[PDB]
Design an enzyme around this catalytic site. Structure first.
Site, PDB file in Angstrom:
ATOM      1  N   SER A  60      36.415  24.255  13.274  1.00 20.00           N
ATOM      2  CA  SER A  60      37.344  23.541  14.150  1.00 20.00           C
ATOM      3  C   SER A  60      37.253  23.933  15.590  1.00 20.00           C
ATOM      4  CB  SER A  60      38.777  23.753  13.654  1.00 20.00           C
ATOM      5  OG  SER A  60      38.897  23.027  12.419  1.00 20.00           O
ATOM      6  N   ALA A 119      42.708  21.417  -2.280  1.00 16.84           N
ATOM      7  CA  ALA A 119      43.801  21.954  -3.084  1.00 16.84           C
ATOM      8  C   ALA A 119      43.234  23.084  -3.953  1.00 16.84           C
ATOM      9  CB  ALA A 119      44.476  20.872  -3.912  1.00 16.84           C
ATOM     10  N   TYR A 157      49.310  20.736  12.491  1.00 15.55           N
ATOM     11  CA  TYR A 157      47.853  20.677  12.609  1.00 15.55           C
ATOM     12  C   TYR A 157      47.256  19.754  11.557  1.00 15.55           C
ATOM     13  CZ  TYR A 157      43.116  22.591  13.352  1.00 15.55           C
ATOM     14  OH  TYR A 157      41.791  22.866  13.646  1.00 15.55           O
ATOM     15  N   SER A 158      46.352  18.880  11.999  1.00 15.62           N
ATOM     16  CA  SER A 158      45.775  17.936  11.077  1.00 15.62           C
ATOM     17  C   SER A 158      44.377  17.601  11.484  1.00 15.62           C
ATOM     18  CB  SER A 158      46.749  16.739  11.077  1.00 15.62           C
ATOM     19  OG  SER A 158      46.206  15.794  10.156  1.00 15.62           O
ATOM     20  N   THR A 297      39.833  28.534  17.028  1.00 14.59           N
ATOM     21  CA  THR A 297      39.403  29.105  15.770  1.00 14.59           C
ATOM     22  C   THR A 297      38.641  28.092  14.936  1.00 14.59           C
ATOM     23  OG1 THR A 297      41.576  28.517  14.920  1.00 14.59           O
ATOM     24  CG2 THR A 297      41.279  30.825  15.642  1.00 14.59           C
ATOM     25  N   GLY A 298      37.881  28.573  13.982  1.00 18.68           N
ATOM     26  CA  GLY A 298      37.265  27.745  12.982  1.00 18.68           C
ATOM     27  C   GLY A 298      37.273  28.400  11.607  1.00 18.68           C
ATOM     28  N   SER A 324      34.955  32.607   4.181  1.00 14.95           N
ATOM     29  CA  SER A 324      36.232  31.937   4.423  1.00 14.95           C
ATOM     30  C   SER A 324      37.036  32.002   3.142  1.00 14.95           C
ATOM     31  CB  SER A 324      36.070  30.521   4.947  1.00 14.95           C
ATOM     32  OG  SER A 324      35.595  29.697   3.893  1.00 14.95           O
ATOM     33  N   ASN A 325      38.276  31.493   3.178  1.00 14.87           N
ATOM     34  CA  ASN A 325      39.252  31.561   2.109  1.00 14.87           C
ATOM     35  C   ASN A 325      39.526  33.004   1.737  1.00 14.87           C
ATOM     36  OD1 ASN A 325      41.089  30.288   0.305  1.00 14.87           O
ATOM     37  ND2 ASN A 325      39.733  30.692  -1.404  1.00 14.87           N
TER      38      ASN A 325
END
Ligand code: 2PB
Length: 345
Positions: A60, A119, A157-158, A297-298, A324-325
């Site tokens: 992002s 999800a 944020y979207s 950030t991304g 990530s995650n």
């Protein structure tokens, strides 16, 4: 500014590794003096070491590139921030009151389609990684859900907002976003490590591999390096390096990428939380020492990025962990900004 704290940076990277990042690194451009540190591996299977010259997916941070292009279109008289989106893209959104400025600042109420996609982290990655979406497809996915708030009314944020951004760019210029990024940003700043190759899955040149952490504690990491990033596009698909992101945010903050008037619009802050704001495709983070820094950030699968500069652009910092995650890693990597801007305590 205080001197950057390399011992502190070193500790941050080491902690990130201890929390599950295969590799972690950071570059600081301190008014012409470089700081560069890296720990761990670019490829955990081969053992190849990570380095600050490795290319990576900035996720992002792409939103800032998209915002720069849009703001140059404002300078050129092609776009009005307070015009409705649907003025330019007729019938796109369910509400003809939603404006360009609201989309760019995440005040539009548009539902974030990525909440449906991811999800479940790894299944969602497996679902999208090899798909090619049109801009419209992603907007339609958002519009299956109601807006979440009135236009302008609330920060939320979207990704959908920066899908709209890419649509707007392409409609108003008649060019692809890749062409616009290249001509308006990559070429003028000589960003030789920066690319937008969508929907190609290859990262050009030497790169850090990305490792997606599964939702299950202790689960095996998934190589997420090669994907279309079509689910994000103008919201997330730029490839870059620490040097090039430092160059980009320094150029932005120092006034080289748009008129003074449009930079001021870009820095009109919407509150995110008690220590953060959001402008137009731009984040403000307030550091413990009373310094604010500006950038983005991304979090694209397997890559956590921080890229922030001081107000005048004279110090810039880009940090990357190739997972990530993993919120422990995400939170730890934020501390690079503390060490780089606030220095030793
Ligand atoms: P990009 O998709 O990299 O981004 C995200 C996605 C979810 C939460 C936060 C952010 C961000 O850091 O901008």
């Amino acid at each position: 500014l205080p001197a950057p704290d390399d011992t502190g940076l070193q500790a941050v990277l080491h902690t990130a590794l201890s929390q599950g990042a295969p590799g972690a690194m950071v570059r600081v451009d301190d008014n012409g003096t470089i700081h560069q540190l890296s720990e761990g591996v670019a490829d955990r299977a081969t053992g190849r070491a990570i380095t600050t010259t490795d290319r990576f997916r900035v996720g992002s941070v792409t939103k800032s590139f998209s915002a720069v292009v849009l703001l140059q279109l404002v300078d050129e008289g092609k776009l009005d921030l307070d015009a409705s989106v649907n003025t330019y893209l007729p019938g796109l959104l369910p509400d003809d009151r939603i404006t360009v400025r609201q989309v760019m600042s995440h005040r539009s109420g548009l539902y974030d389609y990525t909440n449906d996609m991811f999800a479940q982290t790894v299944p969602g990655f497996e679902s999208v990684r090899n798909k090619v979406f049109s801009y419209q497809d992603l907007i339609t996915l958002s519009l299956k859900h109601g807006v979440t708030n009135a236009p302008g009314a609330a920060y939320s944020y979207s990704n959908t907002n920066f899908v709209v951004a890419g649509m707007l760019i392409e409609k108003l210029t008649g060019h692809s976003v890749a062409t616009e990024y290249q001509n308006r940003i990559f070429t003028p700043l000589n960003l030789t490590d920066t690319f937008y190759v969508h929907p190609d899955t290859v990262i050009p040149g030497t790169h850090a591999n990305g490792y997606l952490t599964p939702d299950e504690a202790g689960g095996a990491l998934v190589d997420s390096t090669e994907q279309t990033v079509s689910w994000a596009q103008s919201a997330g698909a730029v490839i870059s390096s620490t040097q090039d992101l430092d160059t980009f945010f320094s150029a932005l903050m120092s006034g080289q990428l748009m008129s003074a008037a449009q930079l001021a619009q870009m820095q009109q802050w919407t509150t995110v939380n008690s220590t953060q704001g959001y402008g137009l495709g731009l984040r403000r983070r307030d550091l413990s020492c009373g310094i604010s820094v500006y950038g983005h950030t991304g979090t694209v699968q397997g890559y956590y990025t921080y890229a922030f500069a001081s107000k005048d652009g004279k110090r810039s910092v880009t940090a990357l962990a190739n997972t990530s995650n993993n919120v422990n890693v995400l939170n730890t990597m934020a501390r690079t900004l503390e060490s780089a801007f606030c220095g030793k305590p």
